[PDB]
Amino acid sequence: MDVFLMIRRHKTTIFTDAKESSTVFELKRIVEGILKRPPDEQRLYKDDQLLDDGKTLGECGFTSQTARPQAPATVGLAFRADDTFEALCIEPFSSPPELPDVMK
Amino acid sequence: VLRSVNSREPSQVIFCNRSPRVVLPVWLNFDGEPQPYPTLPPGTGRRIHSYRGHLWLFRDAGTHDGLLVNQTELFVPSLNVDGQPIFANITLPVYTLKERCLQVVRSLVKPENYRRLDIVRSLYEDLEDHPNVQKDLERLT
Amino acid sequence: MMYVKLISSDGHEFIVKREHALTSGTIKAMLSNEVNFREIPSHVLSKVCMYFTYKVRYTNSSTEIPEFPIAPEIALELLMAANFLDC
Ligand SMILES: CC(=O)N[C@@H](C)C(=O)N1C[C@H](O)C[C@H]1C(=O)NCc1ccc(-c2scnc2C)cc1
């Protein structure tokens, strides 16, 4: 079963899919192909939780019914600058304006 | 041009609403005119009596947004084989993002205030040109 | 796979498949690997990128199609974006 993901780090936001049966490490390989950083320099998160390389996305809560195309699930990403890992930072999206008078 | 064939060969049908909208079945009668039928709530079905060669199409009851029936615009009852009804699956189309954005904007603003919105005059004309059954029958024809 | 970068007014960088972004004729022209949008904020452009995924998933499928959701707060800005993008 396909799961649909937003992988997020600072202002970067990848949109991709993976199988529910695929691993966290396999998703890191996908990030490697796009952002040119290998799995060892990567750290994937679900909310505040670090994920383990050998665990499937399904085991980490990404199911085909929560991680939908129209409303995909977020996966935090953090890089290693040489020595140690940076803190997980996801820049929030912009604020919408106030609902105009006519839309209330 | 688009009219039901007056065959008088009965055809039993299941209108099955696999959409989140309240569905309004529209029969195109023998002189071309759209006749409305009772509404189907979302996820409900009705076993109905129609005839072969009759023409139906399906709309959102509240906004007249177009729905599909068996992947297409129009549904025609075929011959019942095995004494068994023909299945008529009413579903959403994959609307364009633009038309979907129009639907939501239409559902939040009343017709009077479309001109007050801060958008191009091309979009007032798209907003006011709401889905309509006579419009679509002229296209198909 | 082949990816492209779509950049919002506020500097957010959305990386999506090239197939998905070519849905929009405007983006295809803007390419023919990154495309900066001066007028589309990130809260709008993420819904656009969600719509691409949605549209590629459910086009040519007899599975029940769900309603593509749009919050009331972002409907005007998304309308204006789709009208520009033609998707
Ligand atoms: C002689 C002839 O064919 N007369 C037409 C008016 C007729 O009887 N029709 C046209 C269509 O083929 C359907 C049929 C008809 O009206 N059947 C009765 C009917 C009643 C309600 C319903 C519906 S539609 C949604 N819910 C219901 C209960 C469907 C069919």
Q: Are residues B65 and B34 in the same domain?
A: yes
Q: Are residues B100 and B123 in the same domain?
A: yes
For residue B132, give its domain range. Answer: 92-141
Q: Are residues B22 and B47 in the same domain?
A: yes
Q: Are residues B70 and B124 in the same domain?
A: no
d(CA A45, CA A3): 16
Q: Are residues B119 and B80 in the same domain?
A: no
| Residue bearing tokens 């719509």 | C51
Whether chain A has a CB inside 8 Å of the CB on C78: the answer is no
**Resolution rounded to one decimal, in angstroms:** 2.9
Domain ranges across chain C: 1-87
d(CA C18, CA C5): 9
Nearest neighbour of A11 by CB, restricted to C13, C50, C57: C13
Number of domain units in chain B: 2
Q: Are residues B45 and B112 in the same domain?
A: no
Helix (H) / strand (E) element for A24: namely helix A24-35
What part of B 27-86 touches A (C-beta under 8 Å)? none
Q: Are residues B7 and B37 in the same domain?
A: yes
Domain ranges across chain A: 1-104
Phi and psi at residue B56, in whole multiples of 5°? -125, 150
d(CA B73, CA B68): 5
Q: Are residues B20 and B44 in the same domain?
A: yes
Three-state DSSP at B100 gives: helix
Token pair for B111: 């017709």
Three-state DSSP at A15 gives: strand
Whether chain C has a CB inside 8 Å of the CB on A94: the answer is yes
Mutate which of B11, B49, B75, B90 for ligand 1 pocket (most atoms within 8 A of beta carbon): B49
d(CA A36, CA A24): 17
Strand-pairing partners, residue B25, are B58
Q: Which fold has domain A1-104?
A: Ubiquitin-like (UB roll) (3.10.20)
Q: Are residues B103 and B74 in the same domain?
A: no
- Domain C-terminal end among B68, B91, B114: B91
Residue A31 neighbours by CB under 8 Å, 6+ apart: A7, A14, A37, A39, A42, A44, A77
The architecture (CATH level 2) of C1-87 comes to 2-Layer Sandwich (3.30)
Q: Are residues B78 and B96 in the same domain?
A: no
Strand-pairing partners, residue A8, are A13, A76
Helix (H) / strand (E) element for C83: namely helix C75-85
Among protein residues, the one with the nearest Cα to ligand 1's atom 8 is B50
